[PDB]
Design an enzyme around this catalytic site. Structure first.
Site, PDB file in Angstrom:
ATOM      1  N   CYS A 397       0.805  -1.228   0.000  1.00  0.00           N
ATOM      2  CA  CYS A 397       0.000   0.000   0.000  1.00  0.00           C
ATOM      3  C   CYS A 397       0.835   1.274   0.000  1.00  0.00           C
ATOM      4  O   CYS A 397       0.395   2.321  -0.485  1.00  0.00           O
ATOM      5  CB  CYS A 397      -0.933   0.030   1.220  1.00  0.00           C
ATOM      6  SG  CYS A 397      -2.245  -1.167   1.197  1.00  0.00           S
TER       7      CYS A 397
HETATM    8  C1  LIG Z   1      -3.746  -0.639   0.373  1.00  0.00           C
HETATM    9  N1  LIG Z   1      -3.309  -0.411  -1.011  1.00  0.00           N
HETATM   10  O1  LIG Z   1      -4.919  -1.506   0.352  1.00  0.00           O
HETATM   11  N2  LIG Z   1      -4.248   0.729   0.587  1.00  0.00           N
HETATM   12  C2  LIG Z   1      -4.458   1.146   1.931  1.00  0.00           C
HETATM   13  C3  LIG Z   1      -4.965   2.579   1.899  1.00  0.00           C
HETATM   14  C4  LIG Z   1      -5.337   3.059   3.342  1.00  0.00           C
HETATM   15  C5  LIG Z   1      -5.974   4.459   3.463  1.00  0.00           C
HETATM   16  N3  LIG Z   1      -6.055   4.883   4.907  1.00  0.00           N
HETATM   17  C6  LIG Z   1      -7.404   4.490   2.798  1.00  0.00           C
HETATM   18  O2  LIG Z   1      -7.422   4.640   1.565  1.00  0.00           O
HETATM   19  O3  LIG Z   1      -8.379   4.106   3.462  1.00  0.00           O
END
Ligand SMILES: *[C@@]([N])(=O)[N][C][C][C][C]([N])C([O])=O
Ligand SMILES: *[C@@]([N])(=O)[N][C][C][C][C]([N])C([O])=O
Lengths: 409, 409
Positions: A397
């Site tokens: 992420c």
């Molecule tokens: C991962 N790529 O799943 N993304 C997490 C993004 C976290 C963020 N706080 C949101 O978009 O909720």
């Protein structure tokens, strides 16, 4: 330049190829403005301790560098791009920032803000403040609320605003305004940086159908995998299939859409299933009964291919993509308790970043999953990221591959 | 013994006298059973990374020990008491544990758990498992649910199950079942340990009126201060005044009840206002328009003192207690933004433990409050406890003074 000399352009045709260049973003002042009352709105499970979070991110970056990876910080890429951008591009960035602001700016505040932005001495300071958010204190004015312009606290999750797709890119229409504003920078760097200008776009924010990078996967030169999640809708994938079929130079032949639980805290396909080696996958059993699949033919499916439900079980579906027997590794390992699976799934235990086939980086906290990965023959390069994890995202992420070396399939 | 040579019994007539003996509890296995779907139920803001949590607690304890303080671990105090208790008390501990189980035990499970408990070879093992909770795996039995007996995850917040009051104690009827069960150990050690057995009780769990330790403060020999909060009700204070009057050996003469915001995450008076030096207080401005007061006359108010409204503003109210102008220090210090006040108040920024006048211990994360305290002449001994903080309590919450040296007012 933030880019080393070998970087040519976007070149990502796998999830595992030896990582050459990757985009990250160390949480700036934007996370200092996260407050208790706005946690749900801003998308955080709890308030991070800023100092530790930034220290954790530097360790993440260090590990990446120790593996000879060219790490690009979003702020620097944006400022570099701004520095060599035409005056009109420079002024348009400031205008679009003002227009897409949240909260919406009265005309009086827009003037004050535009003047404040334009008065910033350096390129980096301008970018920093646009990401951080702007308070009445910063502007030196009286206001009935402290944040004249809200922060973009989720910027450190560079996986989501845009995704590298082969040699092209998809710049998304994100689900929530708080993150939609992040795509301003994505559009800016690809529309203006020398090394990125030629990059074709398979999707852009104006399309208004929801889709985010955490749902986008590049399994191999032929197949893309996109999740149908809390953030990406099937109809959006259908549009993507259309746009790809419309781009002649694009060589992808198939899209497999994968349905996942629509949980607000495990919002992308990458929080349920990831590909970490040529034939190895990490998934959370919690999605066992929810997984559902659709195939898109980008070759003989017409100019507007439709999703064709694929009734194969997960293992058979994956095998149909790689043509080898797949290895499925359950979150927390065999024999884990439901409490352990739930807890490690909760902290994005499926969300590892592969930097080479079978070599991954992820939070040290999910110890049982780390043990299961090692037992399956995957090398885990842990780093401590307890504070970062509160934002509900792991290493995948917090990264966006810009170029990966070819995989010897 | 867990008690050092000098410990003679409960001796707490202030909030600031040099700390001699204090009760704490390092979070055991009980916090490993906190699952995402049960956060609100188990009373946690987020799931703690258990390993770091325990390391953080050892630092807290190390700091206390570096200041010549006899630190008592609850598990060891209970085990020690058990070892010397009568067979009748030993057996009854197990029966009351089963009787008060959550979820309620079926007759079949009741027999299984009892046998399992009695089979433990050491008293420390017995106490550990009673605190941790019991799974079907621990019992070696088949079951629909994993937890046969729930953990008591909040045990590390030893400030709440009971409070030392002068040379007496109040064992509480807590607000939620998940914590009421913790009082089992409180009653046990005070009813059987030779160095605690002569302590008079001014309240016990059978009274059924809600009250918790975080709301109890011992300002001086004459005045007790009790919060009216999310966990403690005014009517409970009224019953407490009644019990104290009934005790002829008790010398407190006044109870000042203090109304505080009824927030589920800032549940006791000590998350809104604390006394850290002879005339210094730490408070959160967020409670400014909510603070309201009542007085109970324990000398000339009859057998059942009633709460009499006190209209003084906070500064005047405190002065009426210490007979000196108080120094009121606001969370995050002078000039802090509302975001800063909200964030630091959220992480129990008011919740410091005074180990002697003007010298306190608390989390390092609340940096603006730490600066304000030092600027007010208070010495701060911080420690990193970011994981522990997710349980919504700070150092004062994680301790229960057992004896303090007299204060030279
Ligand atoms: C991962 N790529 O799943 N993304 C997490 C993004 C976290 C963020 N706080 C949101 O978009 O909720
Ligand atoms: C301190 N005394 O304020 N207590 C905090 C207790 C926190 C715990 N999770 C609970 O009881 O809610």
């Amino acid at each position: 330049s933030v880019f080393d000399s070998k970087f040519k352009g976007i070149h990502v045709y796998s999830e595992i190829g030896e990582l050459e260049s990757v985009l990250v973003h160390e949480p700036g002042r934007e996370i200092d403005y996260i407050t208790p009352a706005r946690l749900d709105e801003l998308l955080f499970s709890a308030i991070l301790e800023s100092h530790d979070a930034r220290k954790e991110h530097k360790q993440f970056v260090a590990e990446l560098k120790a593996n000879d990876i060219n790490v690009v910080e979003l702020i620097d890429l944006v400022a570099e791009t701004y520095d060599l951008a035409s005056q009109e591009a420079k002024d348009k960035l400031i205008e679009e920032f003002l227009e897409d602001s949240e909260p919406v700016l009265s005309e009086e505040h827009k003037v004050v803000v535009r003047n404040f932005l334009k008065a910033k001495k350096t390129s980096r300071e301008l970018v920093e403040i646009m990401m951080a958010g702007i308070t009445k204190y910063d502007l030196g004015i009286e206001a009935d609320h402290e944040l004249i312009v809200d922060p973009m606290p989720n910027l450190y999750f560079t996986r989501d605003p845009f995704a590298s797709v082969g040699n092209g890119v998809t710049i998304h229409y994100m689900r929530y305004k708080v993150r939609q504003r992040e795509t301003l920078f994505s559009r800016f760097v690809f529309s203006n940086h020398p090394k990125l200008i030629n990059t074709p776009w398979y999707y852009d924010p104006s399309l208004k159908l929801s889709i985010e990078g955490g749902d986008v996967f590049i399994y191999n030169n032929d197949t893309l995998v996109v999740g149908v999640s809390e953030r990406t809708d099937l109809q959006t994938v259908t549009l993507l299939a259309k746009n790809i079929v419309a781009n002649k130079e694009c060589e992808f032949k198939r899209i497999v859409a994968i349905n996942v639980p629509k949980w607000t805290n495990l919002m992308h396909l990458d929080t349920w299933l990831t590909m970490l080696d040529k034939d190895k996958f990490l998934y959370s059993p919690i999605a066992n009964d929810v997984f559902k699949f659709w195939d898109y033919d980008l070759v003989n499916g017409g100019a507007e291919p439709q999703p064709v439900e694929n009734g194969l079980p997960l293992e058979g579906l994956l095998q149909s993509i790689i043509n080898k027997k797949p290895v499925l590794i359950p979150i927390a390992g065999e024999g884990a308790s439901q409490m352990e699976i739930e807890r490690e799934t909760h902290f994005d235990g499926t969300n590892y970043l592969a930097i080479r086939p079978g070599v991954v980086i992820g939070y040290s906290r999910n110890e049982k999953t780390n043990a299961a990965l090692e037992a399956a023959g995957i090398k885990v390069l842990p780093f401590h990221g307890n504070q970062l994890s509160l934002g509900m995202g792991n290493a995948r992420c917090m990264s966006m591959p810009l170029s990966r070396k070819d995989v010897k399939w």
